[PDB]
């Protein structure tokens, strides 16, 4: 019931998809450049650098919080890609598999420990 444990844990699961080469194109920034158009057509960018920095930072209440920048990044992805069957898109499914897989658990644990401490 450790209200706090979410945070290391979320830590942990970023240095694992940092260590995935499917993370490359999600580490920083999208290239402005490289993609003129990206602010186009994604309102809010998103990238692992930023989610890692606003954990560390102490700028997230909840891994629901980083949760939503997470899948923000995997919406990006989606809309922007020209195809479903891109490289970049394809590298962001299994991403978001892998990162939902080990989510689910801290999420369950920390709501679990809110419950309890409400109780
Ligand atoms: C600029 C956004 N990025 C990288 C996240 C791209 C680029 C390309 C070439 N294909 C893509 N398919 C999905 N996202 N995507």
Known sequence: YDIQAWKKQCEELLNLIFQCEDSEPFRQPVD????????????TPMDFAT????????NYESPMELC????????????????????????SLRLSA????????????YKSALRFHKR
């Open 32 to 43: 402005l450049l490289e993609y003129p158009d990206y602010r186009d057509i994604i309102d």
């Open 51 to 58: 989610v890692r920095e606003t954990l560390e930072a102490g």
């Open 68 to 91: 939503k920048d997470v899948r923000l990044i995997f919406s990006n992805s989606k809309a922007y890609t020209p195809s479903k069957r891109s490289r970049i898109y394809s590298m």
């Open 98 to 109: 892998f990162f939902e897989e080990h989510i689910s658990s801290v999420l369950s644990d």
